[PDB]
Every structure is written in C-alpha cells, then in structure tokens.
Design a protein around this ligand. Structure first.
Ligand SMILES: N[C@@H](Cc1c[nH]c[nH+]1)C(=O)O
Ligand SMILES: [Cl-]
Length: 325
C-alpha cells in the first residue's frame, strides 16, 4: 500500500529538535554529535538543514554547508528514522538537497563528505577518494587518567621506554596557524591529501576556511614551526549520548604527518591540556592519523598510557563527487 501522505522537504527550526532526537537513536554507537550541535547548525550562515517530513512528522535529516570559498558543499548528518529505512528516503532527501544547492549556489563545483564504513564497488564508482586516515578510538575516565598520568610517565622515563619529545606552540591569534596551513610544503607534505580534516569536516587550506576554523575553539600543536612535520588539531570536547547518563564527552584529535613519535608526544600534550576540563566525566577520545602509524599509537595508548581501545582498526574516507546538471 502506498503512503497516504507524500514527502515534504522543509528547512529545520528549533521546533523540530525533539523530533530530530527521536529519529537519531543509536547513531555512531552513541558518539553522535547532532544532539550537541543542532542548535549551532541552525545559526550557521552557509548551512541549510533539511528535514524530510511525512504527514507532518520528521523522518529524515540532511545538512548541506557551502565552504571552500563557495566551491564545495559538505554533506553532513544524513539520517533516516529507523522505522523508515530501506524505502529510498535517504536517496530522495539527497536529491532534494542537491537540487537545492544547485539552485541557490551555482558556484558549487563538488560535494564532499567523510565516512568510515567499508567502501564498496558503488562508492568507488560515484566518488573520488581524496585521502583517508586511520581511526583510533579509546576511552578513559578523565579523573583517573589525571590521577595516574604522572606515575605513568615517570615509569616510562626511568624504563627508557618513552620520554615526551619537545613540541612547539601554535597560536591562532599570533598568526602561527596561517603560516603553517597556508604553506604549500605543509599542504603537500603534512596535510592528508592536502586537506585539513577537523572533527570529520574537510577544509581546503585557504584564508577563507581559516576564518571558519578560528571561530571553533580549536587547539593546535606542531613539532617545529620552522620545520613542520607533524601538526595536530584538537576539537573542543562536547557531550554525546553514549551511556545514557550524560557523563560522556567526545574528544576529537586530528593528526597530520608521518612521524609517529611526534604524534605520540602531541597526543599526550593535548590530553594534558583537555583532561583537566573533563574532570568528573568520561571520554571517548578519537585520534585520526596516517594509517601506517595506527599500530604504534594503539600500542602507545594501551600499553603506554593504559587507555582502553574501544574498537579495532577502521578508516576515515574523504570522498568527493562533481556536481552535475
Ligand atoms: N558524514 C558523517 C561524518 C561523521 C561524523 N561522525 C561520524 N561520521 C556525518 O556528517 O555525520
Ligand atoms: Cl573503516
């Protein structure tokens, strides 16, 4: 039997927040950002959050955000209510949103997205792979980490097993971020596929996008400002639904470059910076890094820092498709 009422595509408002939550159960195994981010999305000037409704009720959501100085649309948050899946809803929503973008933003040349599910024949046919990072997901209690870290490092030092390497400060206000990310050799030799990936969101390394990043409260670290080889980027932690008790936060660290020892030392630096703010809370900490460094960093986290690995190796794919007419 056909559905009694047709699909309607509308721009999201704060009124649908509770309805959007109701369709989002179980997404990303509890690491879903949208509960914490929905209200900020509605304020973003280049973003349109589209809801698919049937008979007045929300059944799907997609966000399109124009970035890269008008040349790219980033697709985020695609979701269909569990009870509406497998019927083509996501496909219809994607088509409405692509038509909307082409209508309102003729300058947009490509669509981009990130994902971590295995790529099948279909994906490789429709999308170009710009780059990929390995994904390392660990969990810890922030207070327990802080209470034990001193003794942990001290034993690692006296054992001759690990000592933190020197790292260098990166100030956005001071202009360090721009000097690094606008350097063509950093873009070629450090950034994955020449791209900034920040909490799953890809940006071409441009002054326009640096203004967007500057507003997010990010923390950066580098091995050497004069001779950059490893650059790391920590996104401010935010609440996630995991566990259902409100105590969990998601801490995203993107690591760019090939020197595993510096990824280790910079990871430690970010943990020492961020964990004091997370006292009393539980942390899903997800590190994105060059794939050939994953095993080194997984051992460092589990053996070195006593952190608990949440899942095995997976990959973050940055995918791109041309816009067509
Ligand atoms: N395309 C996904 C990327 C992602 C974030 N977290 C997990 N996956 C989204 O925007 O929701
Ligand atoms: Cl994967």
């Amino acid at each position: 039997e056909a559905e009694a009422e047709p699909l309607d595509f509308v721009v999201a408002t704060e009124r649908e927040f509770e309805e959007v939550l109701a369709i989002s159960g179980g997404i990303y195994g509890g690491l879903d950002y949208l509960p914490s981010r929905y209200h900020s999305w509605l304020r973003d000037p280049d973003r349109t959050v589209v809801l698919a409704k049937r008979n007045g009720g929300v059944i799907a959501l997609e966000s399109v955000n124009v970035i890269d100085a008008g040349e790219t649309v980033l697709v985020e948050g695609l979701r269909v209510a569990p009870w509406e899946r497998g019927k083509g809803v996501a496909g219809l929503l994607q088509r409405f949103c692509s038509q909307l973008v082409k209508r309102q933003h003729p300058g947009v040349k490509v669509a981009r997205l990130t994902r971590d599910d295995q790529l099948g024949p279909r994906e490789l046919k429709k999308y170009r792979l710009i780059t990929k990072q390995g994904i390392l997901l660990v969990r810890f209690n922030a207070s327990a980490l802080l209470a034990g870290l001193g003794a942990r490092l001290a034993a690692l030092r006296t054992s001759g097993t690990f000592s933190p390497l020197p790292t260098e400060a990166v100030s956005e206000a001071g202009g360090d971020v721009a000097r690094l990310l606008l350097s063509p050799s950093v873009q070629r030799d450090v950034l994955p596929g020449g791209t900034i990936i920040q909490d799953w969101q890809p940006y071409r390394p441009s002054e326009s996008n640096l203004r967007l990043l500057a507003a997010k409260g990010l923390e950066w670290r580098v091995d050497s400002r004069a001779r950059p080889r490893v650059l790391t980027l920590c996104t401010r932690p935010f609440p996630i639904p995991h566990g259902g008790d409100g105590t969990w936060r998601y801490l995203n660290i993107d690591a760019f470059g090939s020197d595993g020892a510096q990824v280790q030392s910079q990871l430690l630096w970010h943990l020492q910076r961020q964990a004091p703010r997370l006292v009393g809370l539980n942390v899903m900490c997800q590190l994105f890094l060059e794939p050939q460094l994953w095993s080194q960093l997984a051992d460092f986290c589990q053996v070195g820092l006593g952190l608990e690995l949440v899942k095995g190796y997976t990959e973050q794919y940055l995918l791109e498709a041309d816009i067509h007419h």
